[PDB]
Amino acid sequence: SIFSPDGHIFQVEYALEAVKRGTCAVGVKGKNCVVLGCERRSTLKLQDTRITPSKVSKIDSHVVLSFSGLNADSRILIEKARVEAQSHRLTLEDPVTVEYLTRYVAGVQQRYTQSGGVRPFGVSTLIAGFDPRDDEPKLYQTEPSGIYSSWSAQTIGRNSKTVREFLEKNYDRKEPPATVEECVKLTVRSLLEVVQTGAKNIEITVVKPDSDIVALSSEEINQYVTQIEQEKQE
Amino acid sequence: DRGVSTFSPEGRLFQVEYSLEAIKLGSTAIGIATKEGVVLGVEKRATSPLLESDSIEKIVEIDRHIGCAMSGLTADARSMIEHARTAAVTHNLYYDEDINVESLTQSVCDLALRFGEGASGEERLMSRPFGVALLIAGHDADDGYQLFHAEPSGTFYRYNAKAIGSGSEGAQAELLNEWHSSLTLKEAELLVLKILKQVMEEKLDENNAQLSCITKQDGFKIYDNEKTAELIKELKEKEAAE
Amino acid sequence: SVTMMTVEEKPDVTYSDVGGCKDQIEKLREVVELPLLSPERFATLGIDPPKGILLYGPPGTGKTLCARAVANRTDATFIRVIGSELVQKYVGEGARMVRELFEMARTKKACIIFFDEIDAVGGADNEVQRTMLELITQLDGFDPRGNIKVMFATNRPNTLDPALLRPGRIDRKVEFSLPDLEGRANIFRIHSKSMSVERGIRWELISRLCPNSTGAELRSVCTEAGMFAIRARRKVATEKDFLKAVDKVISGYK
Amino acid sequence: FRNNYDGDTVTFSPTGRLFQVEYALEAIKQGSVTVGLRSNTHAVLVALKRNADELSSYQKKIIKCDEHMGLSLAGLAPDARVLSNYLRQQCNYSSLVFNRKLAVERAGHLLCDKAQKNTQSYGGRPYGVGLLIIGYDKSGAHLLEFQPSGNVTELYGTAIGARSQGAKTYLERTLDTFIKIDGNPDELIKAGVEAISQSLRDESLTVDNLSIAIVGKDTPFTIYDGEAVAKYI
Amino acid sequence: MVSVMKMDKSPTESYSDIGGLESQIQEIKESVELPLTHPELYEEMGIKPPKGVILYGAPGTGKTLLAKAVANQTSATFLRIVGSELIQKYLGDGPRLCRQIFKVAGENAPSIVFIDEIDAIGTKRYDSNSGGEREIQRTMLELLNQLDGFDDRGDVKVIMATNKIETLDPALIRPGRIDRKILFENPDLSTKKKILGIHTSKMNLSEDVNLETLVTTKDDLSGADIQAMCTEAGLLALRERRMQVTAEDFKQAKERVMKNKVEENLEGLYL
Amino acid sequence: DEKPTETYSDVGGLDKQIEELVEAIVLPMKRADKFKDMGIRAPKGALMYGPPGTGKTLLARACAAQTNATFLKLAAPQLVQMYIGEGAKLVRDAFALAKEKAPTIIFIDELDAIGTKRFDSEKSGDREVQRTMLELLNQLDGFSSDDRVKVLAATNRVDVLDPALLRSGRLDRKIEFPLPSEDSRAQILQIHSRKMTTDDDINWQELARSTDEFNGAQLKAVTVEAGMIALRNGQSSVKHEDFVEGISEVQARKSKSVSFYA
Amino acid sequence: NENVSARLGGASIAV
Amino acid sequence: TGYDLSNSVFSPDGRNFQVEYAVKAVENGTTSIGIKCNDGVVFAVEKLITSKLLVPQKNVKIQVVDRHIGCVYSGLIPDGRHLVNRGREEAASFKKLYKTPIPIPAFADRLGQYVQAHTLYNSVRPFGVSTIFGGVDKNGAHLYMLEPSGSYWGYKGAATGKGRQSAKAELEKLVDHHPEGLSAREAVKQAAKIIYLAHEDNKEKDFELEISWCSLSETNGLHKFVKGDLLQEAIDFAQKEIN
Ligand SMILES: Nc1ncnc2c1ncn2[C@@H]1O[C@H](COP(=O)(O)OP(=O)(O)OP(=O)(O)O)[C@@H](O)[C@H]1O
Ligand SMILES: Nc1ncnc2c1ncn2[C@@H]1O[C@H](COP(=O)(O)OP(=O)(O)OP(=O)(O)O)[C@@H](O)[C@H]1O
Ligand SMILES: Nc1ncnc2c1ncn2[C@@H]1O[C@H](COP(=O)(O)OP(=O)(O)O)[C@@H](O)[C@H]1O
């Protein structure tokens, strides 16, 4: 993995296109709440989804993740991330921040760049959650080059171009998401443009303080999606 | 289709000299010396509005009294500054006293040379070299506010002031024309804005850029989103006047 | 006698209708004019002058503007040597052109050639080589000591035997390439000198957006901004209009 | 036309050449000059410096090893630095193991034994510069030449790099003269300085574009750069 | 040579009945038509509008349908030739003929031309040391040099075509000459939108509409086959004698024809 | 050109490979009758190849020195407009004139590249080229009769022309034109420069060592494109760097844009 | 009255 | 063709041509000899000057490995010096053992397999040098030469560089003239003749000479360079043999 004469890298002008194939997901930064939302294969028959590895994953009592792209190269990070979580709670006696492990894993995706015979990932991820003993939301986005950012909304996947600009006709800085019913309406009113099917093809999750995690049924989705399946009419 | 440690018939290496134009893809990053203080400037390359540009950090703080600004490829340089912080603090131990700049900065450009026969007894880390370069600013009590420049080829120069990156070949000409000895600090806190307003792809905001002075009296200081804005009006106090 | 017509009615070119990096012109302007006009500068040293400006430059570059420039400047007579009139199916009859050309040419004055695209005929049951042999017979005779030169251009310098290209044929050769931004800037001034615009803006930073590329796209890309202005109904051009399409010309290519 | 024997080092030519090396030694040809010479008692370093713009400070050309040694380089700094930091250990080691301080010529005969340990192993390039070593011991003063090859030789005075033949020629014009000099380094020094004007492609030396630093049978190593060299121009 | 050239017989291909797109199509009318409407506007800011364009391939995805629709609109000449028909045994015959168009383009100021599938002319500059086939390479040079030797551009217009570019076409094209290297490929919805926007004209859908689900699930395909999709419903009508227009048998054609050209579908790996 | 030539010039280049050759040739010209009295099928020629930039024809001019004799005039001649091997027709009447005046110097040029390696490239009917080479043999046949002729050629080194030469009655012997020392390559540059105003106040001997693999072919070309630049500057006096590094560097490398040097 | 014909040909050889 | 690109790739001929290219590198170097006298050995070498700026008698090319040895080389200056630095410690790690000096067969048996090890692998450069050594043990006189393929044989004399063809036939012209036995001092005359006799391949340039011998008789079989009139006695003589 070397430098082209166009200031680029061959293998990494490539890799981040891999994440542009697979599933599509997003979260946001509500007024006082934070949420995620992702994708599933409807029509996957002869199967029980209780036990499949969810695109969501949890890392601590109070933080979670949502990958995209590959699935193998995702599982590895959670492990060595989990280590740093339930180790950082020990030596220093305080739990994590959000930026710490983000700063960490921002570094590991180049420790697996600059060496001999090591591919980078077909992975891009983001995180979300509230710091301990605070209230302000925090979410950070990642990609194999290591550059960790803080997007108020971030999506990686298929048909995502207009999705990357769909929010900008929808979100307002000085008009943030009021409540969950609208902020989740936001969470779904984005993703549904690529869904092209019912509720079965997705999975979502949410955070509130002091580790108030929830996951919502296929049926709870069929409560609210109808309300805009009713309001996609007038 | 070249490698690392192989010369050409012309002698000019390929990869490192190719590493000397990746910077020209990146952002802009300028710092200018005044004999009573030095400035630093940036172009965030903010791509979307929803983003919260407090998180993007093209500017750092080594200590209470030294800072730098990375340009080109912001990712990789996030590593090397932790080297400098180690040698700064380490030198703050064995001698109980802040370090000269040139004692430090030789180390950093002694790092990026490690891709083959680094300093005495160096195992070759760094399969590839750092695709990033940066500027160093700060005081030590032997020479003055000696700015320093670094590039991953493994050399440093000392400057009055110049630039990097996108606006390099054009912008510096104005700087080459318009620096001298007996200028102020805040004139340099604003002269950059006459320049960076040139080579931005949109009208300036208080959030496109941000600044940070450096002073032997207080030490290090980043400004706020608004305290750039007030001087821009001060620039428009001359842009509207003249 | 298909091309039996020396030059056109009006060449509309100037040596300042070009950015062209300013350096590839001098020796070219030197070889063509200084033996021509100041052989005392030749005998000032007592030289062995050249006979041809060998050349290669990728097309879509102002060599050919540069080629049409010496036409309008010197005001002398001119030619065009291309396979159409040159190469003909009747074996041997093809070489009537070269003979009536050069045997005339030695008679005339300032009738220097622009026999471009010889990469067509000069490439390696095919009879093209014998025409190429018909050439070199003509050149070794007169080659030195004359106002005449042999200056032309091509697209593929590695597509011809240099058995012809010995040093007495085209010695001080020519090489072209794309410009710097400054070369890309001064060329940009040229095609900017027609329309209505938002006068007094920072054009130069766009020439920062000239990576490896031709000037030809730049005289193009301004008109698409006017086309963009046409659809925009912009009676006068601005900055962003140039941007709104030049961002697309390369990405559509990339 | 396209020598495939141009890749890694170890491949010999079909004629007995290492095309990496021969294509390296033209580097210093693209580098600057730094000259030097000696009497029977005093030796000299000299170096034009090569500056970036009208604003920058200058690229350095001279470094002290230790109290009875200095050197000067040509072409590349970074691969040339480490050899300086290298032999400091091999000049401290002397003055701590023995205290019978370091003779100059074995350093070169150490130094040649370094680069050869870098040519004949896959990976690694030569320390591709030329450089000049000086100093004094019980044996008088000595000057040296260096090649990234390994060849090092005891010379009276020589030159390096671009434009150097003009200065190189003054020495053969003058080797009858400057060898008989002693205890009077001033006029000695300006021998090269006048002689390297032969190289100036109208850059017209200044207070600061030049660096000089010398040694004697008495003097420890001293550098004359900054503004002290109004003496000579 | 002239015989094939003057194809003044535009079909009933109805420009603006086609429902494809706009921006491309203004881009040509802006390239061509509006210049023939009030070209003083180009004279206002002093513009030399372009010397024709070049679309790309993506076959069966709307190469030409506009073009004969333009011919239906052309309001000028229209020309048509083939390089394979242009070429001959002897040397320079076709090259001697290729010149003879531009004077027949000098026929008119309303002088325009389509060209037919260049893929055997000017494809790529192989050395062609292997005999014979240098004729092609001897011919392209007879054109491009003829194209821009010394030309006021004389409304010497052009529009070209192919099916794949990077397979060929290395150096022939140049900007200004052909500034607009442009596209046609699948819309990802608008085949659903305006195609049956057209085909709703004739048919009845004699029980319902059903079109709210006779639709695209981001299905990789080419809407050109939609003119099969209309077909076989009528056939399957008459595989069971439905003189009317159904929506139920219409199902099969996508389930039948779109199902043949299978893809790998290896996306049990990017989840 | 046809003449009883003048004196051989300074031997100079390659000479250690050359003194052993006039040995080989003049004796066929000198008392080969005594060889014919000794009764030997002594040859009618040999071959001297090697890359040009050499002075090959000078050795051809050296041929008639020890015994006066006349030169040759033909260069890629058989590449004709007609069906005939018109040259090959002339080769009879010309080699007949080599049969005339038994003291005679015969040197054709580019035997290789007038004669291909194996003539697979061309069609069956080559225009009697094997017939021309058949003339060469049938004229070498008449040349093999006597000691009048004495023949030699020169082209690309070996394995580039026909392999016929293996028979000792045909050709029997080969020498090469190797790369020489350069002190004479120094002198010839004055000879190139002899027709041009200049000086020589240079140490071009270290220079002559520095370059290599730039043949007399190359070095017959160098001398002018740095005469122009100092005129383009305006200077007149010859000079080292403007010509040595001004020519030897510009060959393939240029555009010195290096930063990390110092 | 003619002999001035020459027609190109097609081959396909091993690379 | 395609097999002539790296170490350890035999040919259909059964060879690796790369070292055979090394032979032309060592062919591109200075002259050097060493003779088996009646009681010891001799060393003498060519040492050409480029400019006057090169100092005389500070830049020897002989190297010593230990007391009872002298060694020289020709061709690559550094590479022929490396294995000396291997030599200088090896025998030192052998006098370490039974507390006696080292034989000469011990030398090549501890070197001639070394350079071989630099022709087994695809990662190193064959030592492009030909090399000489000699001296004395308890047994008596010895002499050897090396070639870069590891080989070595006990000669009465040797030669390298571009001083091959002169000396080889000359020594053929010597030995029959004097087979009875040639003592130390006398060969020091006749040796320096040959170098003045062998420069004629490169008499464009100049040089100066450098000699060393070692006698069981004279110097207790220790190594001792020449520095004195004895050298000047020979150059005054050797000019006559070319006179
Ligand atoms: N350096 C330049 N100076 C002036 N004009 C330029 C330059 N580069 C490109 N152009 C413009 O681009 C347009 C197209 O270039 P041009 O016609 O010279 O290609 P060309 O070199 O003629 O190709 P070919 O070799 O096939 O004839 C011209 O109108 C020309 O003026
Ligand atoms: N937007 C559209 N509306 C209606 N039909 C379309 C559309 N796009 C493509 N088609 C169908 O595609 C077919 C041919 O399209 P296209 O122009 O791409 O190829 P073509 O011109 O027939 O091929 P060629 O140029 O090789 O002869 C037509 O039968 C047409 O019905
Ligand atoms: N003493 C000399 N006098 C004249 N020319 C010489 C001399 N020595 C060498 N040459 C050169 O030898 C070259 C002739 O090489 P040669 O192989 O005969 O060329 P070609 O193959 O074209 O006949 C000329 O370029 C000429 O400059």
CA–CA gap between residue D200 and residue D209 (Å, rounded): 12
Chain breaks in chain E following residues, C–N > 2.5 Å: none
Mutate to test the interface with B, among C205, C238, C239, C242 (most CBs of B within 10 A): C205
**Is the Cβ–Cβ distance between C17 and C69 less than 8 Å?**
yes
Q: Could you tell me the maximum CA-CA distance found in chain F, to the nearest angstrom?
A: 76
Tokens 């390298």, located at residue: H160
Name the strand (E) or helix (H) holding F231.
Answer: helix F227-233
- 8 Å CB contact between E247 and E205: yes
Asked if F230 contacts C30 with a C-beta cutoff of 8 angstroms, the reply is no
Token reading at H174: 């010597």
Tell me how crowded residue F184 is: count the other CB atoms within 10 A of its CB: 19
Ligand index nearest the alpha carbon of residue C12:
1
Range of the domain at D27: 2-233
Task: Give the span between the Cα atoms of A114 and H162, in whole angstroms.
Answer: 50
The CA radius of gyration of chain G, in Å to the nearest whole number, is: 13
**Whole-number Å distance between alpha carbons of A135 and A131:** 7
Look up residue F193 and give its two tokens: 């420069």
Residues C8, B240: Cα–Cα separation, whole Å: 55
User: In angstroms, rounded to a whole number, what is the distance separating the alpha carbons of residues H196 and H238?
Assistant: 7
Nearest CA to ligand 3 atom 20: F52
Pocket test for ligand 2, best of E18, E25, E64, E201 (most atoms within 8 A of CB): E64
Q: What are phi and psi of A69, to 5 degrees?
A: 65, -125
> Annotated catalytic residue: which of H1, H30, H31, H131?
H30
Q: Are D169 and D70 in contact (CB under 8 A)?
A: no
Beta-bridge partner residues of B150: B134, B156
**How far is the C-alpha of H177 from the C-alpha of B46, rounded, in Å?**
94
The beta-carbon neighbor of D77 closest among F206, F241, F262 is F262
For residue B49, give Cα distances in angstroms to A151, A157, B46, H9. Answer: 9, 20, 8, 63
Show Cβ contacts of residue E112 under 8 Å, excluding neighbours closer than 6 positions. Answer: E32, E74, E76, E77, E78, E79, E155, E157, E158, E159
Give, using CA atoms, the residue closest to atom 8 of ligand 3: F55
Paired tokens of E27: 């881009």
Segments in F66-147 forming alpha helices (H): 86-99, 111-114, 129-145
Of the candidates F230, F251, F232, the one whose C-alpha atom is nearest the C-alpha of residue F241 is F230
Tell which of E84, E87, E91, E134 to mutate to test the G interface (max G CBs under 10 Å): E91
Question: Is-contact C88 C2, C-beta < 8 A?
Answer: no
Length in residues, chain H: 243
H30 is an active site residue? yes
Cβ atoms of residues E108 and C79 within 8 Å: no
C19 pocket-lining for ligand 1 (C-beta < 6 Å): yes
**CA-wise closest residue to E162 among E140, E142, E134, E181:** E181
> For chain B, which chains pass the contact test of at least 3 CB pairs under 8 Å?
A, C, D, F
* Vertex F76: Cα angle to F71 and F77 (nearest 5): 75
* Pairing relationship of beta strands E180-181 and E53-54 according to DSSP bridges: parallel
CA distance C93 to chain E (A): 13
Q: How many domains does chain D have?
A: 1
Rama region for H101: left / alpha / beta (φ>0; ψ in -120 to 50; rest) = beta
Residue A107 burial class via C-beta count within 10 angstroms: exposed 0-12, middle 13-18, buried 19 and up? middle
Residues in Cβ contact with A9 at an 8 Å cutoff, skipping those fewer than 6 apart: A1, A2, A3
Question: Residue D170 is encoded by which pair of tokens?
Answer: 């003054």
> Can you tell me the distance from the alpha carbon of D31 to that of D19, in angstroms, rounded to the nearest whole number?
19
Whole-angstrom Cα distance, residue C24 to residue C20?
Answer: 7
Exposed / middle / buried, residue D36 (Cβ in 10 Å: 0-12, 13-18, 19+): buried
Sequence letter at residue D35: V
Q: What letter does residue E194 receive in the DSSP assignment?
A: I
User: Taking the CB of residue E181, how many other CB atoms lie within 10 A of it?
Assistant: 16
Q: How many whole angstroms separate alpha carbon B50 and alpha carbon C81?
A: 62
Which 3 state secondary structure label does DSSP give F46? coil
Ligand 1 neighbourhood includes C65 CB (under 6 angstroms): yes
Partner residues linked to C151 by β-bridges: C53
Beta bridge partners of D43: D38, D215
Looking at the domain B1-242, which fold is it?
Glutamine Phosphoribosylpyrophosphate, subunit 1, domain 1 (3.60.20)
Check CB contact under 8 Å for H204 and F183. yes
Q: How crowded is the C-beta side of F110, counted as CA atoms within 13 Å?
A: 11
Q: What is the rounded distance in angstroms from the CA atom of residue H128 to the CA atom of residue H20? A: 10
End-to-end alpha carbon distance in chain F? 57
DSSP bridge pairs for H134 = H70, H143
C-alpha F219/C-alpha F242 separation (Å) is: 15
* Residue E102, token pair as written in the block: 């531009």
Rounded Cα distance, B39 and B160, in Å: 12
Cβ of E24 less than 6 Å from ligand 2? no
Q: Nearest Cα to F21, choosing from F131, F175, F137?
A: F175
Closest CA to D136 of D72, D211, D221: D221
Written as one letter, the residue type at C243 is L
CA B144 centroid distance within chain: 18
Ranges of H-type helices in A40-114:
72-91, 99-111
DSSP per-residue codes, F151-206: EE---SSSSSS-SGGGSTTTT--EEE-----SHHHHHHHHHHHHTS-----S-HHH
Of the ligands numbered here, which is closest to the C-alpha atom of E190?
Answer: 2
Nearest Cα neighbor of F14 from F68, F64, F45, F58 is F58
D5 neighbors D19 (Cβ within 8 angstroms): yes
Round to whole Å and give the CA distance between B189 and B34. Answer: 10
* D70 strand-pairing partners: D64, D134
For residues H226 and A171, what is the distance between their CA atoms, to the nearest angstrom?
A: 94
CA torsion angle A97 A101 A103 A106 (round to 10) = -150
DSSP single-letter state for residue F80: -
Structure-token pair, residue A168: 């900008």
| Bridge partner residues of D155 (DSSP) | D143, H54
Nearest partner of E21 among E215, E213, E164, E193, judged by Cα: E193
Q: Which amino acid is at D74?
A: A
Report the nearest-CA residue for atom 6 of ligand 1.
Answer: C62
Give, as one character, the DSSP assignment of residue D118.
H
Domain boundaries, chain B: 1-242
Helices marked H in D41-164: 78-97, 104-119
Total residue count of chain D as it appears in this document: 233
Contacting residues for D88 by C-beta, under 8 A, at least 6 apart: D65, D66
**What are the C-alpha distances in Å from F36 to residues D70, E41, F29, F42?**
77, 97, 12, 8
Our CA angle for H131, H132, H133, nearest 5°, is: 135
Burial of D214 (0-12, 13-18, 19+ CB in 10 A): buried
Residue among C41, C50, C171 whose CB faces F231 most closely: C41
DSSP C70-132: HHHHH--------HHHH--SSTTTTHHHHHHHHHHHTTSSS--B----TTTT------HHHHH
Cα H51 to Cα D154: distance, rounded to the nearest angstrom: 12
Give the angle subtended at the CA of B126 by the CAs of B120 and B131, to the nearest 5°: 120
The experimental resolution of this structure, in angstroms, equals: 4.7
| CA separation for the pair C76, C112 (Å, rounded) | 8
Pairing of strands A137-138, D157-158: unpaired
CA C254 to chain centre: 28
Q: Show Cβ contacts of residue E233 under 8 Å, excluding neighbours closer than 6 positions.
A: E245, E246, E247, E249, E250, E253
CA A121 to chain centre: 16
* B167·C208 Cβ contact <8 A: yes
Of E201, E254, E211, E202, the C-alpha closest to E232 is E254
Residue F244 half-sphere exposure toward CB, CA atoms < 13 A: 24
**F170 φ, ψ to 5°?**
-80, -70
**Is-contact C171 C52, C-beta < 8 A?**
yes
> Which chains touch E (3+ CB pairs under 8 A)?
A, C, G
User: Which residues on adjacent β-strands are paired with residue E53?
Assistant: E159, E180
**φ, ψ at B89 (rounded to 5°):** -60, -45
SS3 assignment for chain H:
CCCCCCCCCCCCCCCCHHHHHHHHHHCCCCCEEEEECCCEEEEEECCEECCCCECCCCCCCCECCCCCEEEEEEECCCHHHHHHHHHHHHCHHHHHHHCCCCCHHHHHHCCCCHHHHCCCCCCCCCCCEEEEEEEECCCCEEEEEECCCCCEECCCEEECCCCHHHHHHHHHHHHCCCCCCCCHHHHHHHHHHHHHHHHHHHCCCEECCEEEEEECCCCCCCCEECCCHHHHHHHHHHHHHHC
Q: Is the CB of E50 under 6 A from ligand 2?
A: no
Which of D4, D116, D153 lies nearest to residue H82, judging by beta carbons?
A: D116
Q: Which atom of ligand 2 is nearest to E64's Cα?
A: 17
3-state class of E164 per DSSP?
Answer: coil
Do residues E144 and E187 make contact, with C-beta atoms less than 8 angstroms apart? no
Query: Which CATH number do you get for residue D203?
Result: 3.60.20.10
CB atoms within 10 A of CB C159: 17
Please name which of F201, D158, F182 lies closest in space to residue H50, comparing C-alpha atoms: D158
D171: part of which helix (H) or strand (E)?
A: helix D165-172
Distance from C-alpha of F8 to C-alpha of F28, rounded to nearest angstrom: 19
CA distance C189 to E147: 26
Beta carbons of D25 and H33 less than 8 angstroms apart: no
In angstroms, what CA-CA distances link E53 with E15, E29, E76, E175? 19, 11, 18, 10
Which residues of chain H lie closer than 8 angstroms to D149, CB-CB?
Answer: 77-78
Atom index in ligand 1 nearest the CA of residue C155 equals: 25
User: Look-up: residue for tokens 């391949």?
Assistant: H201
Residues of B in contact with C208 (CB under 8 A): 166-167, 169-170, 199
Contacts of H186 (CB under 8 A, 6+ apart): none
> To 10 degrees, the CA torsion angle through F213, F218, F219, F224?
-140
In order of E193, E194, E198, E201, E228, the CA distances from E206 in angstroms are 21, 21, 17, 13, 19
Give the containing element (helix H, strand E) for E42.
helix E40-44
Contact (CB, 8 A) for B124 and B144: no
In ligand 3, the atom with minimum distance to the C-alpha of F187 is: 1
List Cβ neighbours of D140 (8 Å cut-off, separation of 6 or more).
Answer: D40, D41, D217
The encoded tokens of residue D137 equal: 């011991």
Q: What is the C-alpha separation between H98 and H83, in angstroms, rounded?
A: 23
The verdict on the CB of residue F220 being under 6 Å from ligand 3 is yes
Residue E60 near residue E105, CB atoms below 8 Å: no
Chains that touch D (3 or more CB pairs under 8 A): B, F, H
Residues whose CB is less than 8 angstroms from the CB of residue B176 and which lie 6 or more positions away in sequence, other chains included: B162, D53, D54, D55
Inter-chain contact C220–E129, Cβ cutoff 8 Å?
no
Helix axes C181-191, C216-232, angle to 10 degrees: 50
Whether the CB-CB separation of D77 and H46 falls below 8 Å is answered with: no
Distance CA E112, CA A215 (A): 64
Tell whether E161 is in a known binding site: no
CB of B164 closer than 8 Å to CB of B22? no
CA-wise closest residue to D107 among D149, D152, D172? D152
Joined together, the tokens standing for residue F242 give 């403007």
Token pair, residue C88, equals 């003909």
Do the Cβ atoms of B29 and B39 come closer than 8 Å? no
C48–F79 CB contact, under 8 Å: no
Way it was determined: cryo-EM
Q: How many CA atoms lie within 13 A of E89 on its CB side?
A: 4
| CB neighbour class for B202 (10 Å; exposed up to 12, middle 13-18, buried from 19) | exposed
What are the contacts of H102-107 at 24+ separation with CB within 8 A? H102/H66, H102/H137, H103/H137, H103/H139, H103/H142, H104/H69, H104/H133, H104/H134, H104/H135, H104/H137, H104/H142, H104/H144, H105/H142, H107/H65, H107/H69, H107/H133, H107/H144
First-residue to last-residue Cα distance in chain G: 42
